[PDB]
Amino acid sequence: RKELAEVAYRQMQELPYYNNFFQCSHPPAIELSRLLSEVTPKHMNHVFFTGSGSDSNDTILRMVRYYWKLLGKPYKKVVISRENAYHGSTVAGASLSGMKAMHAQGDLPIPGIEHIEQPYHFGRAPDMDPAEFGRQAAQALERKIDEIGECNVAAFIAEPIQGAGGVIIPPDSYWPEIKRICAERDILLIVDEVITGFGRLGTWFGSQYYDLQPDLMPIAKGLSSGYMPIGGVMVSDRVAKVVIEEGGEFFHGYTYSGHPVAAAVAAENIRIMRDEGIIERAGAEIAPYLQARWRELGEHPLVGEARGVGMVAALELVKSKQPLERFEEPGKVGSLCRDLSVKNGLVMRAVGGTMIISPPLVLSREQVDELIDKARRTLDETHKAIGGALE
Amino acid sequence: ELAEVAYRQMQELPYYNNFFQCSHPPAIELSRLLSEVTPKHMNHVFFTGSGSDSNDTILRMVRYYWKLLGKPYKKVVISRENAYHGSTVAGASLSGMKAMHAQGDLPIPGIEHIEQPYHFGRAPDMDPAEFGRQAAQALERKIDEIGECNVAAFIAEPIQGAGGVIIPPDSYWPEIKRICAERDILLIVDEVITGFGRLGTWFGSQYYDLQPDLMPIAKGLSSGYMPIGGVMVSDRVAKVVIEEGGEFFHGYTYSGHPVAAAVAAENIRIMRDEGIIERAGAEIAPYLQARWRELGEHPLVGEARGVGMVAALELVKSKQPLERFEEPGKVGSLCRDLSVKNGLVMRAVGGTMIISPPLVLSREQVDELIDKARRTLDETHKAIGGALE
Amino acid sequence: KELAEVAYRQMQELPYYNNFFQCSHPPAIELSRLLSEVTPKHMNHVFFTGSGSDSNDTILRMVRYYWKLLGKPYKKVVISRENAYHGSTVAGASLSGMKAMHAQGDLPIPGIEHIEQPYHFGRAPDMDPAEFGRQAAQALERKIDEIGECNVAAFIAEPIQGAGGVIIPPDSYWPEIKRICAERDILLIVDEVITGFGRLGTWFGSQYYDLQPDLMPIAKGLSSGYMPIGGVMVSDRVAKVVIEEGGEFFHGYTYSGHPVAAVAAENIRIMRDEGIIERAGAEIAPYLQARWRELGEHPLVGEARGVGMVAALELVKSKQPLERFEEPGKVGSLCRDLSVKNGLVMRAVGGTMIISPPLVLSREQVDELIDKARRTLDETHKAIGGALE
Amino acid sequence: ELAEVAYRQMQELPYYNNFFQCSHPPAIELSRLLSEVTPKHMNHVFFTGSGSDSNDTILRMVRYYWKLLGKPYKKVVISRENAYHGSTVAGASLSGMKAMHAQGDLPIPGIEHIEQPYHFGRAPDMDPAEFGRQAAQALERKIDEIGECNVAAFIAEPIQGAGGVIIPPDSYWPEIKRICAERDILLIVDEVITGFGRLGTWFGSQYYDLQPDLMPIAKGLSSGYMPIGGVMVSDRVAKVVIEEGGEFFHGYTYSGHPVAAAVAAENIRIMRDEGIIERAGAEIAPYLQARWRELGEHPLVGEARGVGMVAALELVKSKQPLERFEEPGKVGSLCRDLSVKNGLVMRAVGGTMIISPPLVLSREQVDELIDKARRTLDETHKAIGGALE
């Protein structure tokens, strides 16, 4: 999560370090380090602090469920996720994510989790146009609910784009469908802003870009641009008018939670992410330069895909582009290209054969072309150590 | 004064380091490199963000450890009633607090609880050497119910900080040592709270002399200044996890946080040099015990107990005749504010008054908080005794 | 006197050793399994088994396969009632709301639970029955709401729990249950093994209480105790679906059961012509009821309930103040004996004396058991009148 | 001719054995006072309705056993895939035959499966001695996967008749007893089909020489002529269940059905004195096996296996190359009418022709079924001669 938890500045920016008032709660004598703002998606005006997006996802589940329990349905209790999707490392987070190394047959998905098709087009959609394999994938949802029990089901999770497993930007019509089905069946909606978070793309959160209107959302990293461990959980007023108009087991966080020192920070991080307007140099100014400069796989046979939006991007290491192929072991040519990316003058990752980039937001127009000819020199390069190599 | 230990304020730590985000690449100043102080047969260490994330991850390990030996059916762990071990779903299911588990969602599968050694509220007049056993043996009666081939460990705070105090009689932890081996299981001890000079020795384990194989630390690691969670390991558990690891081959070497680290990294470095660990249990603690053993003739104080650098006492109706209020907490907390609004830091679960002072405390300071609460114990005596009880 | 058998006490010659006892696979021999539609209203198919146990067991896989082809493989769980006997098959022990068969957690199995019984004499002391019938009926709505209308698939229950002693619901009970199996849109299976074939004033107990179940199972009463055989009847609703794309239960309707069990194929016909249920229902039953309903002046009897061809009465220490003994069971079974040894065949679930006589019974044969039981009342009334009981 | 065992038809029996249904009160002619013919260490039995309801009461008892030893967790039982262990939700779950489970309502919690020793449906090339070893060890690999103290029993017909006749090779069953004696579990074998009166002895348990701790019987007890189910028990399992009893304290004082017991009683008292079994396994058997083994040069058959009184054989499309059809059953069943429309009785599980004749078979009759079977095979062979199949 290097350069992806960091969501604003490279280095050398200074901050209201050491508050020196670090414990919490209790009668007077403080300075109030947790009175933060709402550049939030329009209808969200409460939130809940924790130790991480991993210590975040753990509490959403007691949330979504306490909710439906106090409305009369101690059964609307399951939640739906997707395969190959990162959703935190907390055993909850593990149950929530459809990665194969968390579950490992037993242990997880603990009671109350199962996973649906994830909209990965280059490798789960042969030639279908994009507008439908986002519909298909979106309806794959409704299948799982009529295959479970609406009065069993409680909400649906999803990062706006699956980062941590190779960018799975959704075909444009995925989110629009998902919008109806949450209204036709009437359940809840939580989005994971641990990644994406405070900018990383066109707008602030992934909500307003893709417009969606989540009942809840965690934010964690990027709140401090990696600078601090702070776990966030923003709620919607519906969800809120239930846990709070009827509660007592959750009248303590909104009374006190989180750590003053990690908060007192992000206040400036957002308060300095605002004015200077990176959010606007990032979306109306510097990003249409990354994507027009990215996606230029041009004539790189190893690349058969090249994608991205806003401030993140990726592309897939194939063997050939006539047949849209992958290597027999999709991961040897990827895991041996990272080093050829870090050992040449640029930082990049690759969940398998998918070189993934996620750079921060102060970037200018001149430090862009660099990680173009840096990777173009790492991409024309890994095109001789795998061909010379027999694979 | 609980999450923190030893350093109220005025102390300067390596703050603004301004090299902060490091996951794989060099820990700039290697901030993740700390010290195996007095863990002993515990020489490796795993980082998180808080204890809630520690006790969370401490379960994926056990269930991973055993399965590599051939026993994917040894999974269920066991805890204790009124014992806190986090607030994350693994931790909320592990802790013995009923006001978090509601209609199935907690406890998760592979969790159950046992009879907690609360001799005050659970033991009439039985000799502590006895109650220590039956509440210890209350474990063995929970393993045969399930099967020594289904159990995968037993956790426990050395003493329950978050459920008042709950000292185990001397005879408790002695037995536990026997059962945990007679049935071949692992012992993780909750250290987050008792950790770090909060008792007489470094960790709460050395006092009671046990040799756990995983402990979770947090808060105490930096005396409250920074969020972080820690998880410890035995030369054992580690060897096997690494013998044929994989998913976990990425922590002891690239985990935790570069900033919070160096801070705590300063926190302990100064607890050593300045020898607070030594001023706390050897010099001052006994005065604290010796002087907190003073319930005397307060019809409200009937129990008085303490170990190292922490203590408590219970509120009642009548001292000699066994009797307690008709709803402690309607009378305890109403004494909590009577300690702060008089001049002393004191939480109240509702009737078991507590004291969690830092390690730099001084005799005079000892004397100081005594009369101040005697005033608060002279006062609340008629505040609620003056009423119709 | 005796259950399972519902017709002819002894010496009635059926069509025995018909031999040719092969069925099903080859062309049939003489059509053993072809039985009458003698008043099930709209139920027009049937499935066969070996006994009540081996019957209800097959109603689950059916029910749960019903919704499984309407598009809701999750209406899988079913409800039943306490102090009810629905077989000794494992699902028959789970469906039966009796604790003495629920072995551990293995019994009851997933997808079953239990609700209040309309036992107006043990659950209700003086409450108005109608409301007691309404609530204990409303106790279902609660459970479904306690489980989830899209989790529940149906509900079973005995027209009168002959196994739970005898538990006639208040007149307002079932009329409300009719509504709820629609309010939540679900099925309704009734158990007629005991109540089936007379036993009540009508044929089944459905017809008496006026209802329309989706399936019902019968046994014993079919062969009047003469042959092992179990029947599981079905509605023209549930049917159309199973055959609309059959495959798993297109097997029995076309062929299942047992030839020689067609014995009952004459147990009903010879129950039809002679008009036994006829005279049984309209002629002899009303005589019996008003007469058995005569606790009169018997400090042992204070409840007196009877229906169709079946009744009971609870035994009591003192009825001026409604009472039971200090051990209902140490004394009740001390009278059944005092019935047979005195000359009448009664059973006692513990203090609730029972009777279920075959349907051929006559008028003059009514008074005979009466004084005789009375002769067992006055006796048992005073034998323990001298003890320390 | 599967369920039934001896006496093709026309043999008369003590039918009309009076007409009763007794239990607690006195009885006539004793009733269900049957015999003990070569079970050996078995001297008890629990009478049942059908082999479905038989294999269902061997499970509560199974667990009720380990319960009363103090192991409430030894709940599990291990079966074998493609095995017919009843239709009762226990029998259908225990049975390793998919199509009975339905993915949701079965398998009930607490049942998994292993591999079946199908030497020619899988592993026709490995030396039989080893495929028996692995096929046996296949049990340990799932007990080292569950919990040697979670597991509670292994259920295996001597041979899977419903699945054809997949006779376990020689080395399979020796290890099974070694293993069953190692990990501390019981042994339960379904002698319903196989045993009672087929094979080379009464029950097959005497042929393979194993010491079953539990045994169901049914069907062939009456040679079909009545519905009956039986649960034979081991003095081991015995000294235990009745000591407390509970759900089995008295059942042996009365159960079953007087009439289905009076019948079979003769079926055993007559199968002895007429020496059916004796001639069955000594004289009339080895001539049959010697002759069914004659797949000779039939391109359709590739193996000819059988043992005692029962056999079958595999159909294919080439032999030297053992190639099986692209969808056996589009061709197996198509050879089943080709024996009824010629004059002999065979079932086909999908491509395997099973033969299940009775014990009163004669030599001239043996020779009959042979040339008449060959007429079929030689009839069944011309019908494809290289279709597009």
Numbering used by the authors:
A (entry chain C): 69 to 459
B (entry chain D), D (entry chain B): 71 to 459
C (entry chain A): 70 to 331, 333 to 459
Publication text:
We aimed to crystalize and solve the structure of TR2. The obtained crystals were optimized in 24‐well sitting drop crystallization plates. The crystals of TR2 diffracted moderately, and a dataset was collected at 3.6 Å resolution (statistics for the data are presented in Table S1). The TR2 crystals were phased by molecular replacement using PHASER in the Phenix program, and a model calculated with AlphaFold as a template. TR2 shows an asymmetric unit of four peptide chains building a functional dimer. The TR2 monomer is subdivided into a core domain, which is the PLP‐binding domain, and a C‐terminal subdomain. The core domain is composed of a central β‐sheet consisting of the strands β1–β7 surrounded by helices α1–α2 and the short helical structures η1 and η2. TR2 is a functional dimer, as represented by Figure 1B; here, the tunnel for accessing the binding pocket with the catalytic base (red circle) is composed of the two monomers (highlighted in different colors). TR2 showed maximal transaminase activity at 45–55 °C, suggesting that it is moderately thermostable. Interestingly, TR2E2 was designed using a site where a loop was missing in the crystal structure of the original transaminase TR2; the loop contained one mutation and was modeled with Prime and refined through MD simulations.
Herein we present the development of a PluriZyme, TR2E2, with efficient native transaminase (k cat: 69.49±1.77 min−1) and artificial esterase (k cat: 3908–0.41 min−1) activities integrated into a single scaffold, and evaluate its utility in a cascade reaction. The reaction proceeds through the conversion of the β‐keto ester into the β‐keto acid at the hydrolytic site and subsequently into the β‐amino acid (e.e. >99 %) at the transaminase site. In addition, we report the crystal structures of the TR2 enzyme and the newly designed TR2E2 PluriZyme. It presents the typical type I fold of class III ω‐TA observed in known structures present in the PDB database, and it contains the characteristic pyridoxal‐5′‐phosphate (PLP)‐binding domain composed of β‐sheets and the catalytic base Lys289.
